[PDB]
Design a protein around this motif. Structure first.
Motif, short mmCIF file in Angstrom:
data_model
loop_
_atom_site.label_atom_id
_atom_site.label_comp_id
_atom_site.label_asym_id
_atom_site.label_seq_id
_atom_site.Cartn_x
_atom_site.Cartn_y
_atom_site.Cartn_z
N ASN A 144 0.82 -1.20 0.00
CA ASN A 144 0.00 0.00 0.00
C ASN A 144 0.86 1.26 0.00
N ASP A 145 1.93 1.27 0.80
CA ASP A 145 2.73 2.48 0.94
C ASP A 145 3.37 2.88 -0.38
N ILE A 146 3.76 1.91 -1.21
CA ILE A 146 4.36 2.23 -2.49
C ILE A 146 3.39 3.00 -3.37
N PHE A 147 2.13 2.56 -3.41
CA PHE A 147 1.17 3.18 -4.31
C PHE A 147 0.88 4.62 -3.92
N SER A 148 0.74 4.89 -2.63
CA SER A 148 0.51 6.27 -2.21
C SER A 148 1.76 7.12 -2.37
N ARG A 149 2.93 6.51 -2.28
CA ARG A 149 4.18 7.24 -2.43
C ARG A 149 4.60 7.39 -3.88
N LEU A 150 4.26 6.44 -4.75
CA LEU A 150 4.69 6.48 -6.14
C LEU A 150 3.46 6.48 -7.04
N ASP A 151 3.43 7.39 -8.00
CA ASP A 151 2.30 7.49 -8.90
C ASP A 151 2.24 6.29 -9.85
N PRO A 152 1.06 5.99 -10.38
CA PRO A 152 0.89 4.79 -11.22
C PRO A 152 1.84 4.74 -12.41
N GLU B 32 4.95 5.19 -12.65
CA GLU B 32 6.21 4.55 -12.29
C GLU B 32 6.10 3.61 -11.10
#
Lengths: 49, 49, 50
Positions: free
Chosen positions: B35-43, B45
């Motif tokens: 989950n943290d990756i998706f909120s931190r990195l835009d779709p 990349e």
């Protein structure tokens, strides 16, 4: 001012942040809702979702 | 000699525990939390990580 | 350049949408990306240099 393209002054501001190592002193703009108990629900606790 | 039976149990328990421990591995990504990756990195990349 | 004037920002709500519209900035970069959704994430130990 004559040396237009080359050496015109640019101001640079760089901000650094650390990611959720502890309670967040600073936070973004987001509303808070009442919590529910004993319910299968989505939760977003201080950025931990 | 019951260790022969015990070793069968321990190996399965050890292998399962190893699988569980592997989740914390970042595998070269930013973090081990999906989950943290998706909120931190835009779709555009995020899929790379 | 010598000073590296730095600020320790804490205990406030930070909105960066102000910056985007501000002073028609002609360049920016994040190295952690998600410029649109920086506003959703809380932060610890925000430290900004200029």
């Amino acid at each position: 001012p004559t040396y237009g393209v080359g050496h015109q002054p640019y101001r640079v501001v760089v901000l650094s942040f650390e990611l959720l190592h502890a309670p967040a002193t600073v936070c973004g703009p987001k509303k808070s809702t009442n919590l529910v108990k004993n319910k299968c629900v989505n939760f977003n606790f201080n950025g931990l979702k | 000699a019951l260790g022969k039976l015990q070793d069968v149990v321990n190996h399965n328990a050890q292998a399962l525990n190893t699988l569980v421990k592997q989740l914390s591995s970042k595998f070269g990504a930013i973090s081990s939390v999906l989950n943290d990756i998706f909120s931190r990195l835009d779709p555009p990349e995020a899929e790379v990580q | 350049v010598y000073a590296w004037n730095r600020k320790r920002i804490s205990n406030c709500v930070a909105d960066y949408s102000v910056l985007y519209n501000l002073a028609p900035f002609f360049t920016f970069k994040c190295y952690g990306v998600s410029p649109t959704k920086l506003n959703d994430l809380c932060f610890t130990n925000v430290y900004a240099d200029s």
